[PDB]
Design a protein around this ligand. Structure first.
Ligand SMILES: NC(=O)c1ccc[n+]([C@@H]2O[C@H](COP(=O)([O-])OP(=O)(O)OC[C@H]3O[C@@H](n4cnc5c(N)ncnc54)[C@H](OP(=O)(O)O)[C@@H]3O)[C@@H](O)[C@H]2O)c1
Ligand SMILES: NC(=O)c1ccc[n+]([C@@H]2O[C@H](COP(=O)([O-])OP(=O)(O)OC[C@H]3O[C@@H](n4cnc5c(N)ncnc54)[C@H](OP(=O)(O)O)[C@@H]3O)[C@@H](O)[C@H]2O)c1
Ligand SMILES: NC(=O)c1ccc[n+]([C@@H]2O[C@H](COP(=O)([O-])OP(=O)(O)OC[C@H]3O[C@@H](n4cnc5c(N)ncnc54)[C@H](OP(=O)(O)O)[C@@H]3O)[C@@H](O)[C@H]2O)c1
Ligand SMILES: NC(=O)c1ccc[n+]([C@@H]2O[C@H](COP(=O)([O-])OP(=O)(O)OC[C@H]3O[C@@H](n4cnc5c(N)ncnc54)[C@H](OP(=O)(O)O)[C@@H]3O)[C@@H](O)[C@H]2O)c1
Ligand SMILES: Nc1nc(N2CCCC2)c2c(C#Cc3ccccc3)c[nH]c2n1
Ligand SMILES: Nc1nc(N2CCCC2)c2c(C#Cc3ccccc3)c[nH]c2n1
Ligand SMILES: Nc1nc(N2CCCC2)c2c(C#Cc3ccccc3)c[nH]c2n1
Ligand SMILES: Nc1nc(N2CCCC2)c2c(C#Cc3ccccc3)c[nH]c2n1
Lengths: 251, 251, 252, 249
């Protein structure tokens, strides 16, 4: 019987690249989404076309609130409901926008979305994953290679990703006696929005040592797939940068 | 005019030592506290006896909630209303208890307290402090030298301290243009409670390379004093471990 | 035509596992060795029995000296001599013994062996590798140490050597990225405890590891190397992958 | 009796400022130097004019070689010879120049860059410990060690090694009451002779004040680490960089 994976924020971009890759490697997948309903269902469609009854979608807001623990438990429950098991959890969903310290979402909303999606939801999904448990159980957290050279005025976002590093380590340590490995993948710049000005994209592209290009979504997913594989059976609490050397470039 | 400082969680233990040492150095102080009202008032009394009109108290819960931004604004305000200025903020208050991943406060309450006290309140206090501004302005965040080798079952506490590192770096970068430095002090083991077990204290003491003892509250306060001083005027985004070598000791 | 890899200290243990997997993946290999001459020659024999003239041996002391630069150049040269190309370099060879700060090799000899093997020879091999250079996939993997920030008591020069190696991994990734050469590390925690260590002692270390209360196999370390040299790691450079079972996360 | 400090590479620039500050604090000082004899003697003279018999010079090359351990032992020995004790060691001496991967031989590059930045600090540390009250060592590291300058691999390997020495020695010497810490400068005291356009280019990158560190600012952190206010601090490295290491590309 095939193992099952939950991928948060999997309707598009990096998260969809990860979902697809697990599916192709033989996983059944829960495609989680928040707002992108049409993209999520469309992907579950493709993948079920490929193999019937191997994908489902699951809608959840991962903003922090008093019901977030229930929402995270229901995401995990939804994998068991659909597949009878849950082998892999990939915490990919993330809010990203500036929250300047000195001067519109209220600050309470900004805290809730940025810390919720990047850190607390990952923690709650990890609790639920562990609680509901031959096997290769693992969690992969999507981190950020630039957390120590942060974007100006992204304090909440940066605190959220730092918290996620802390979760990755704490969960690796705690869940090792249950056979559950917990690792991260830390993109540098990846998948630049089409919208973004072509000269702005080139400005950033030119900073990357390896090929003066951003990472493809495929390249990020490749590192996730490694960490979930039997090729990584002794790896836990590791975070693999996938950044083309960007984090090494001084100002 | 003497400079003024806010110290969170200043009624007892390390926060109290930081408040005393700053007051000794010539600062006027706001003693924030949550439950330790008699100790906070007694400290204020003792400090005002040394020097009239140099200490006030401010009570607030720093748990994450819809009212935390106003509470943090209140705390900074208390310093302006008493003293007419606010030069230094020390983010010392901190909830600390285990939050095991595998199963009595609800989990969402555990999240609110541990992430609120250790990260979100320090972010909101930082915003409020910055917004209100040859001065020597700075922020010192009490971090944790053991954050990369965390205690088992302390996930949320560790996440909170990692976020606080993230805040330290982000805010150092963003507030540098205003002349506000942001730094950290990372204690190892300091001031073990009297009522904790003798076997367990001996166990931990014996692990510290430098002297086989915990730090005194005054030794932690010494590093805070340095960072706020004119001897640290080029230092921002730095985190000083005060751990007797404990973090260097392998398992 | 098949790519080619140099693996230093490849006669035994982890280096041997790395050479074997690389060869199994389709690489031709230079098995570098220092003292383990029989092991190196019998390994090359086993590999060539599988595929003809896909393995050669190359002996060199990698202690720091006046002759180390030429030795390192000759290791890379031997790969070009045998196989016409050199696509991968794995810096695995390493001296490891204590050098207490406070009180019969002299200290200058300990410096030369520990800093030479762990840091200087990798630098020189990296220079020679790069100097000699869209289906190209060139890369270097340096064998680091997951416990570098919580070092063994009395192992200052070894630990200095491994820190220098992290520095090289970063500096060389930055500098060689324009040439298409990636530079990464694999950082074991405890792996393949020596056969002659008593099991009761092996178990004292084993017991510290969160993930299974055992040490890594040589093949588990090799698996990380294989990943880093693969096409699945094409945007990965300057990265160090811990393969430590969570050991570095465990407090005193 | 006043305590005594050894400061390597102390004839000029940042090492000189550290010596000056330790001397102002009440230390007797060994000013080690390699080539800057005139500056070193002039400094010793000035410090002894301020307080008699409180400074000496000591000449040594700290390039790696088979005699480096004896040279390091002799530096520590020179502090005991002059002052009867040795309380503080500051490993400041450092070679710094590019060594690209693609007149000096590479053997010589390795010897100077790895010797000065790492092996000499290790040997000096051994000699300091062996010869033994608030005893401590401060190693001058580099806040940019993880975002290094292009083509500076050996320099960078040296400073990484020095971080490892700081940790290993803090761990090992702690039972002897000897603390070991680091100060990691960002851009500091730019050469007067360096091009103004280039200086301005690097200055404008620094978040805190858009200026380099003064040598006195670096020294202030050294002074803290050797003081009685840092008696529980060992194995720590304090960046003194105005936030420069926080700035992405
Ligand atoms: N792109 C980069 O350059 C880069 C750099 C560093 C790190 N990373 C990391 O890699 C991961 C993926 O990057 P990306 O660019 O693909 O991400 P993205 O496009 O910014 O967002 C990924 C998904 O997160 C989900 N999400 C956002 N807010 C949410 C909420 N409140 N509740 C639930 N889900 C929410 C969204 O789902 P819906 O669309 O369904 O609403 C969105 O599709 C992230 O964790 C990111 O931080 C990316
Ligand atoms: N002690 C150590 O070994 C150690 C080690 C590493 C880091 N640290 C850090 O150093 C700092 C001082 O340590 P400590 O041992 O002195 O801390 P502590 O005694 O655990 O707590 C300090 C104060 O935090 C305040 N606090 C707790 N929950 C709060 C809430 N919901 N709202 C507002 N305030 C709250 C409390 O004030 P009230 O008493 O008034 O209720 C408490 O007295 C902390 O940031 C800690 O995390 C300490
Ligand atoms: N084993 C572990 O737990 C562990 C932990 C952390 C990191 N690592 C790293 O992983 C790598 C492999 O570990 P290992 O335990 O397999 O290594 P090892 O058995 O200690 O030695 C590897 C090889 O290094 C070669 N070597 C030693 N001194 C040399 C010299 N002076 N010149 C040239 N070559 C020399 C030896 O070759 P000959 O036998 O031919 O003389 C030896 O076979 C090393 O880089 C190590 O530091 C290992
Ligand atoms: N300046 C910066 O921006 C910066 C940045 C990061 C770190 N740092 C660190 O801070 C420390 C001081 O920096 P700096 O700019 O003052 O240093 P510097 O001017 O480059 O050199 C300091 C001294 O090192 C001594 N030295 C060099 N090679 C030597 C050798 N082979 N043997 C013995 N001594 C040798 C020289 O002595 P003589 O003059 O007597 O020959 C020189 O005066 C260094 O450790 C440096 O790495 C500085
Ligand atoms: N969830 C999430 N989304 C991100 N982005 C979504 C819009 C483009 C970037 C980033 C992102 C970025 C970026 C970026 C950096 C330089 C130039 C353009 C984009 C970093 N972490 C992120 N996390
Ligand atoms: N707010 C807060 N409080 C802490 N403590 C309050 C009770 C003593 C420890 C710690 C603490 C600790 C500890 C400790 C660790 C090992 C042995 C004994 C105490 C670490 N971070 C903390 N943060
Ligand atoms: N070249 C080299 N060799 C190592 N070893 C070779 C013999 C066993 C370990 C180690 C090693 C180790 C170890 C070890 C630690 C605890 C228990 C047993 C082995 C760490 N880095 C190493 N580098
Ligand atoms: N021993 C030593 N000396 C350095 N320098 C001596 C004169 C120029 C800088 C540096 C140095 C530098 C620099 C610098 C950075 C930006 C612009 C100009 C110089 C970094 N590490 C150093 N170590």
């Amino acid at each position: 019987e095939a193992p099952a994976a939950v991928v948060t924020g999997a309707a598009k971009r990096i998260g969809r690249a990860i979902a697809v890759k697990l599916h192709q490697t033989g996983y059944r997948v829960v495609i989680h989404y928040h707002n992108s309903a049409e993209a999520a269902v469309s992907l579950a469609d493709e993948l079920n076309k490929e193999r019937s009854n191997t994908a489902v979608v699951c809608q959840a807001d991962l903003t922090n609130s008093n019901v977030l623990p229930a929402s995270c438990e229901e995401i995990i429950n939804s994998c068991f409901r659909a597949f009878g098991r849950c082998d892999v959890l990939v915490n990919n969903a993330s809010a990203f926008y500036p929250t300047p310290l000195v001067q519109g979402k209220t600050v309470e909303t900004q805290v809730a979305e940025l810390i919720g999606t990047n850190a607390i939801a990952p923690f709650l999904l990890t609790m639920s994953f562990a609680q509901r448990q031959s096997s290769n159980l693992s969690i992969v957290n999507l981190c950020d290679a630039m957390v120590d050279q942060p974007c100006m005025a992204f304090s909440l976002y940066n605190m959220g990703k730092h918290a996620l590093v802390g979760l990755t380590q704490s969960a690796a340590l705690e869940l090792a006696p249950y056979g559950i490995r917990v690792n991260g993948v830390a993109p540098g710049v990846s998948l630049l929005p089409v919208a973004m000005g072509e000269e702005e994209k080139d400005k950033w592209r030119r900073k990357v040592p390896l090929g003066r290009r951003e990472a493809s979504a495929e390249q990020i997913a490749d590192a996730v797939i490694f960490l979930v594989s039997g090729s990584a059976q002794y790896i836990t609490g590791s975070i693999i940068k996938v950044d083309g050397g960007l984090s090494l470039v001084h100002a």
